Design a protein around this ligand. Structure first.
Ligand SMILES: [Cl-]
Ligand SMILES: [Zn+2]
Ligand SMILES: [Zn+2]
Ligand SMILES: [Zn+2]
Ligand SMILES: [Zn+2]
Ligand SMILES: [Zn+2]
Ligand SMILES: [Zn+2]
Ligand SMILES: [Zn+2]
Ligand SMILES: [Zn+2]
Ligand SMILES: [Zn+2]
Ligand SMILES: [Zn+2]
Length: 270
């Protein structure tokens, strides 16, 4: 290897965690997934790049289902496909919890919990240390340093959330379910598990009733149009909250961007 293993990642959380666990060791790139990860269909060029790589890392078969149809053996490729969330426990989708198509029941937005981002980093560090065992002492040392700062960041917002008077927030899509359950909050998504799941009229009426009931002052959006109409019917305000679905394109690391989003959330819920 020149620079190292040529690793390709699914989207921004996986890219950031692989780049921080690997450190200055390997050449890590990610396919262009700015346009939605839930409604992302890869091109032939991206698939050819994945087959010409050493390691491909994706989050879960519940998010990037197109990574399951990948078959490296029949295409004479040596790429090692790694599921970064193998072994993790996925909670039920809000609104489908007592349901018993089976991929729809589990929420894949598990990288926004600071603690479950840390679990993903350990799994990547172990998996990359089965694939390139010689540099394993570094994959763990860097994985162990990220979990500590994620643990350092989770015991810091615990008290801020603990003293919040309002524990309910509404978001453009249902992505903050794990983060909300982490700090004892109650969230409601307008578009649900996927931004292409626009609400039904009855669901829209129930969302209006919910905003009026729990005195939700602001609606967190992403940088959808239906979310931009409830401001009239409810009188709420529009504040930004990035679910880190894509690259923020700045100098901060992953946990720093997560810290910024949590800080916005904590300053609003007071
Ligand atoms: Cl998302
Ligand atoms: Zn299509
Ligand atoms: Zn799987
Ligand atoms: Zn496995
Ligand atoms: Zn239940
Ligand atoms: Zn190596
Ligand atoms: Zn080395
Ligand atoms: Zn406490
Ligand atoms: Zn989402
Ligand atoms: Zn009702
Ligand atoms: Zn910090």
């Amino acid at each position: 290897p020149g620079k190292g293993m040529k690793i390709v990642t699914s989207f921004y959380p996986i890219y950031a965690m692989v780049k921080e666990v690997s450190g200055d060791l390997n050449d890590v790139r990610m396919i262009q997934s700015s346009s939605g990860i839930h409604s992302f269909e890869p091109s032939a060029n991206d698939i050819a790049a994945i087959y010409d790589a050493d390691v491909f890392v994706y989050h879960s078969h519940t998010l990037e289902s197109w990574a399951g149809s990948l078959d490296p053996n029949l295409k004479k490729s040596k790429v090692k496909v790694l599921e970064a969330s193998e072994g993790m426990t996925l909670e039920r989708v809000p609104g489908l919890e007592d349901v018993e198509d089976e991929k729809t029941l589990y929420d894949p937005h598990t990288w926004l919990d600071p603690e479950k981002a840390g679990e993903e980093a350990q799994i990547i560090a172990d998996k990359l240390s089965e694939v390139d065992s010689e540099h394993k002492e570094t994959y763990q040392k860097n994985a162990q340093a990220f979990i500590k700062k994620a643990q350092e960041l989770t015991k810091k917002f615990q008290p801020k959330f603990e003293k919040a008077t309002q524990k309910t927030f509404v978001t453009q899509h249902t992505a903050f379910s794990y983060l909300a359950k982490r700090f004892g909050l109650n969230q409601l998504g307008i578009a649900g598990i996927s931004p292409e799941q626009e609400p039904s009229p009855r669901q829209l009426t129930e969302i209006q009733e919910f905003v009026k009931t729990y005195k939700v002052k602001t609606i967190f959006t992403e940088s959808s149009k239906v979310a931009e109409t409830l401001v009239k019917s409810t009188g709420v305000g529009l504040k930004t909250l990035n679910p880190l679905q894509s690259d923020p394109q700045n100098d901060k690391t992953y946990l720093e961007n997560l810290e910024e989003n949590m800080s916005i959330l904590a300053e609003e819920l007071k």
